[PDB]
Amino acid sequence: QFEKIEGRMIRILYLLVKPESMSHEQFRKECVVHFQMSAGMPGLHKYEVRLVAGNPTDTAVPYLDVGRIDAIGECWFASEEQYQVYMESDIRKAWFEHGKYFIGQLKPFVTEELV
Amino acid sequence: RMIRILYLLVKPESMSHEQFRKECVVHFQMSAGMPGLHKYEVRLVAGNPTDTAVPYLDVGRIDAIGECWFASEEQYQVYMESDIRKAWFEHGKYFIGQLKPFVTEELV
Ligand SMILES: C[C@]1(CC(=O)O)C=CC(=O)O1
Ligand SMILES: C[C@]1(CC(=O)O)C=CC(=O)O1
Ligand SMILES: C[C@]1(CC(=O)O)C=CC(=O)O1
Numbered sequence: 122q123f124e125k126i127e128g129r130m131i132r133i134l135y136l137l138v139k140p141e142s143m144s145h146e147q148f149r150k151e152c153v154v155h156f157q158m159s160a161g162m163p164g165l166h167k168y169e170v171r172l173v174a175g176n177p178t179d180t181a182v183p184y185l186d187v188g189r190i191d192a193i194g195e196c197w198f199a200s201e202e203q204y205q206v207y208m209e210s211d212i213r214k215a216w217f218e219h220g221k222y223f224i225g226q227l228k229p230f231v232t233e234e235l236v
Numbered sequence: 237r238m239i240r241i242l243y244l245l246v247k248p249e250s251m252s253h254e255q256f257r258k259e260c261v262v263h264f265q266m267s268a269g270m271p272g273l274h275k276y277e278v279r280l281v282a283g284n285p286t287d288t289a290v291p292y293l294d295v296g297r298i299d300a301i302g303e304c305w306f307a308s309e310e311q312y313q314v315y316m317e318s319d320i321r322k323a324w325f326e327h328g329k330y331f332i333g334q335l336k337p338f339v340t341e342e343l344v
Binding site (some may be wrong): 134171187 | 240241242244246257260264269278279280281282283284285286288289291292293294295296298300301302325328329333334335336337339340341342343344
């Protein structure tokens with residue numbers, strides 16, 4: 122039941138691609154640092170970051186090429202007000218500064234729960 | 237630990253946005269009690285902010301995000317072998333025009 126309410130929070134999913142010049146070894150270390158920095162982030166209920174480890178191409182339906190994605194990020198916000206506390210935060214600004222260092226390109230999707 | 241595969245879904249060009257939304261819901265309903273599957277989730281893409289604080293990545297129009305969780309490699313195989321799983325994928329062919337799978341790895 123906690124997980125159900127959690128699933129219906131404001132959620133933004135991000136595709137990350139590392140800077141061209143950064144090694145994979147360093148990129149993985151900087152994802153870990155980025156997660157450490159999320160702790161106590163004002164307004165944020167939850168953050169998750171994962172590497173892309175596999176890119177299977179034998180899909181039953183036609184395969185969508187979106188190029189090489191290195192990691193997937195996700196943020197959960199418990200309310201419109203909490204999202205605003207985040208979006209106003211200096212601490213978020215400093216998180217994004219680290220983001221500019223280890224994230225070369227970023228695609229965010231704002232998602233909508235169906236159930 | 238937990239195997240996770242995240243999917244970018246694009247609807248078929250023969251289908252409306254609203255039809256697609258309805259098929260997403262049906263697809264979730266079909267997944268209940270699927271052999272080998274720990275969890276399935278499907279959400280629409282409702283917003284495409286481009287006002288990013290690092291360089292914006294363009295991957296085209298993604299309509300939905302799907303995701304599967306499997307407890308173990310053994311459960312994943314039970315799932316792959318399952319007849320009802322195969323029928324669920326046939327429903328996938330109906331409402332998913334193009335698919336991108338990502339097999340993920342945890343960092344913390
Ligand atoms: C929310 C945020 C902050 C940032 O990009 O630095 C954006 C992507 C991500 O993984 O973390
Ligand atoms: C869509 C979003 C959300 C956020 O601030 O994490 C806004 C800027 C950005 O880089 O990602
Ligand atoms: C896991 C799956 C199964 C399918 O292809 O129907 C693939 C994407 C999706 O949303 O559901």
